[PDB]
Structure formats: structure tokens, C-alpha cells
């Protein structure tokens, strides 16, 4: 009995009877705070405690799973630091925005330049959202991380037309893009089930900030940073902010992000897209 099977790479053991020499042809069987990263730092005194996505910290690629023979670069200070993005003005009918990582930082800083000169990319991310309000403001924001977020299309509304979203929507860049039908998230999936993935609630009466640490999640250790988007970020105003007349109507939403444990490989020429 050679070990060719699919379940023989895990830590769980199963009992199975097999009448052939291949284990995959067998049967089933019995089943058994202040964050300082690099040159930048942040202090969040109003923020809820940090939510670690799937209970794992970002770390360097081990030699067991690493298939690349090149020795990667680790520019710790010039790569991993807090990157502040543009602010999104909130309105009562605002449907929410979404960003595609790691497509936002491709044009920004040393991280963006080395990403164009390197074919292989692996890093962890740090998600931070900032929305400020006073005691007279009542609202709620839902900040969630959905791995492999695919954009759909209404197909003209009839359903008989085959159309795909262009590169502007699938690759919004640094500025981001806005949701059309937040109920389906343009995935055809309910919004009420979005909390199954790592999420954090921003309630303007208590916590005005959010922090989520998302590690690297892919079926491959290294992957191209330009084409493949790892996960998206969703800031959805579930409860519309309400304020009476005379109060300040401009409520910004600031999203700052940082990479963690970045490794680059395959030094090559300049490749934009």
C-alpha cells in the first residue's frame, strides 16, 4: 500500500479497507492598543481589540511548502509599514465601497515598485478602518474580509446576455470602487451571511476604529501580485447614520493598510499590468 492518497497530508487518521494498490481508490471509512510596524506607528484608544483572521499570524514561508529555488528578498523597513489611503465621504444613501488587495499598493512606495520587478509574491496584510463621529451621531459600519471576492454582473437584468465586469471594476486600484446592490454584494450571496468570514463592527457610540489581521491565504505559496487578488475589503453602512439639522454632515471614512512578512522572488523587468 503506497501512500498516494489525498488525506495523508493532514494530522487526522482514518480507517479504510482497500482491495487495490492505490489508496485514492479506497472507500471512505470511519470519520474522526498601539501597533508599530516598521517606520510607521498608530495608537488606537477608542478601538475594539484586534481581531485575528482565522486565528493565525502572518509569518514567513517555511522551506517545507516552498517550491521556489530562488532566495527571496526581505526589505523589512521599506515594505512593511502603515499605508494611509484616501478618505470616503459618508452620505445617507451611501451603499459602501470595496478594495481589492493587493492591487491598492501596487502604485505606492517601495512595495509597489518591487512588486513590478518580481514575479512571485507572498505577504500578510493589516486592515485598519477609521470613521469618526460625535455623541449625537448614531450609526453602524460592517468591516469584513472575504477571501476570493468575485464580482458578478446583472447581465442587463434579463439574464440572457453574457457579460463580464471590466478591468476598472475588477481592479479598482488605490481609489477603490462602490457597490451597486449591497444586498447581494454583487456576488449573488446574502449580506446577512457576511459575518461568517472574519469581520468587525464599527459602532459610532463605542468603537470608532477597527483592526483586522489577515494572513496569506492561497493554494500556492507564491503567486503573481498583479493578476491575482487575494481578498477584498468591505465597509458597508448597515445602519444609516442619522443626525439632526445643524450637526456636521461630513463624516469621513479612512482606511489604512500595511503588509506583513513580505517575500519577493523572480527578479525581472518592469511589468505594469
Amino acid at each position, epitope marked *: 500500500e503506497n501512500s498516494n492518497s489525498a488525506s495523508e497530508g493532514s494530522t487526522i487518521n482514518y480507517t479504510t479497507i482497500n482491495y487495490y494498490k492505490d489508496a485514492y481508490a479506497a472507500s471512505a471509512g470511519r470519520q474522526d492598543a498601539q501597533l508599530t510596524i516598521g517606520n510607521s506607528t498608530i495608537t488606537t484608544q477608542e478601538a475594539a481589540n484586534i481581531v485575528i483572521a482565522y486565528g493565525e499570524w502572518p509569518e514567513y514561508c517555511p522551506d517545507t511548502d516552498a517550491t521556489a529555488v530562488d532566495k527571496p528578498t526581505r526589505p523589512d523597513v521599506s515594505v512593511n509599514r502603515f499605508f494611509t489611503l484616501d478618505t470616503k465621504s459618508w452620505a445617507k444613501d451611501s451603499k459602501g465601497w470595496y478594495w481589492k488587495f493587493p492591487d491598492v499598493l501596487t502604485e505606492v512606495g517601495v512595495f509597489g515598485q518591487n512588486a513590478q520587478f518580481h514575479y512571485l509574491y507572498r505577504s500578510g496584510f493589516c486592515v485598519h478602518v477609521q470613521c469618526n463621529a460625535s455623541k449625537f451621531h448614531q450609526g453602524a459600519l460592517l468591516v469584513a474580509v472575504l477571501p476570493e471576492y468575485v464580482l458578478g454582473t446583472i447581465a442587463g437584468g434579463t439574464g440572457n446576455e453574457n457579460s463580464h465586469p471590466p478591468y476598472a471594476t475588477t481592479q479598482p486600484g488605490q481609489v477603490g470602487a462602490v457597490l451597486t446592490h449591497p444586498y447581494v454584494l454583487d456576488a449573488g450571496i446574502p449580506l446577512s451571511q457576511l459575518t461568517v468570514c472574519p469581520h468587525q463592527w464599527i459602532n459610532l457610540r463605542t468603537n470608532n476604529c477597527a483592526t483586522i489581521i489577515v494572513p496569506y491565504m492561497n493554494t500556492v505559496p507564491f503567486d503573481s501580485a498583479l493578476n491575482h487578488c487575494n481578498f477584498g475589503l468591505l465597509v458597508i453602512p448597515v445602519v444609516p447614520l442619522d443626525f439632526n*439639522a445643524g450637526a456636521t454632515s461630513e463624516i469621513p471614512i479612512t482606511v489604512t493598510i500595511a503588509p506583513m512578512c513580505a517575500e519577493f522572488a523572480g527578479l525581472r523587468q518592469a511589468v505594469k499590468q
Partner: antibody
Amino acid sequence: QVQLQQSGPELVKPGASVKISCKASGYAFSTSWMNWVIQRPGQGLEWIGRIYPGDGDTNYNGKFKGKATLTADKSSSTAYMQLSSLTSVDSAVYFCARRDYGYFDYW
Amino acid sequence: DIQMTQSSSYLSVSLGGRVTITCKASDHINNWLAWYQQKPGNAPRLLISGATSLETGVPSRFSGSGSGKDYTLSITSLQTEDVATYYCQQYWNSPYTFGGGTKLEIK
């Protein structure tokens, strides 16, 4: 200089839809908001809605929430306003302006 | 929904004199107001921004002033090209409420 070029007049029977073009020139199209203003002859004036061409979000009013739909194109630097369910009271003069410090700098 | 009343609709002053137009709102706008000038058949033109500061290209005869909920617009002196319909805007809160308007004529 900054120039805003609209389209010409339109004549259509009630019940159809109409699209109006506004094209900015000499300024960054996705950097600033693009508003819309209706003037009802001759004494009425009110604000319609705005759009940010970078993201594409739309901020409407209470009455015009369901009637008007705003879209934008970053390639041609042009903003669109689509009206649905046109009636006799929906005939008026439409304006295209931009927001800078919170006022309307150019019409 | 902030109602801002502009009264009255019609007032007449001769040339070489002074004119005062009051634009009052319901709540405190934090001195954010924009006076407009629209000639018949043309688009509005900005004059005062923030109830005090001027624009570039606007003559110094236009001077806005005010405090609290009462804001005025003083034009001295009056000429033949300054006769038009004047407006006032509140950009402090959304939606932006435009003024009722004041049409000027010679007495």
C-alpha cells in the same frame, strides 16, 4: 481653464427615458464631485444629486431618489444623467456643476 | 431638510444707491453660504463664498456680511450689468437648500 459642455435640447413624449451628457475639460475628472441642478421655470431652483467619478457612488435627494440615475465614465471624462418615467412636471432646465470647497465653482 | 427663507421676492432701487438682500435659514450654518448671480437665459455665477471672502474676477463693489442666522449682501454702487436674480446656498448640510431668489429692477 475649466469648461463644462452639455448637450442640446431634447423633445420626447411622456413615458420614455432621456440621457443628458456633461463633459468636463481642462481639469481632473475623477478628482472632484459632479453635481446636477434643476431650475423649474421660472421661480424654482433646487439641487438634484452628485457623483464621484473615481468610485462611481451617487448621492441623491429625497424626491429624485427613484427618478434619476447618475453614471460617469473616466475614459471620456463625461458625466451622464438618466431620467425615467418622464411626466409633464419633469420638464425644466438642468445644470451641471462641480464641487470644490463645498460650493459650485463652475457651471 | 433645512429650510432657508429668502425675502422678499421683489425689491427695486435706482442706480448709484445701495441695496441689501437678506437670506435667513432655520439653524446655524457656521457661516457657510454662497451668493449667486444669474442673468436671464444664462447660468448662475458665484460672487460670495463663505459669506465673507470674495472670488477672483469679481469686482470689489460686492461685499457680503452677517452673523448668526441673518446674512446680508451689500452692493454699492448699482450699475446696469449688476441687475439680475440673486441666490443664496447652504452647503453646510445635505441636501443643499437653494434660496428663493430676488429679482432686481430699477425704480
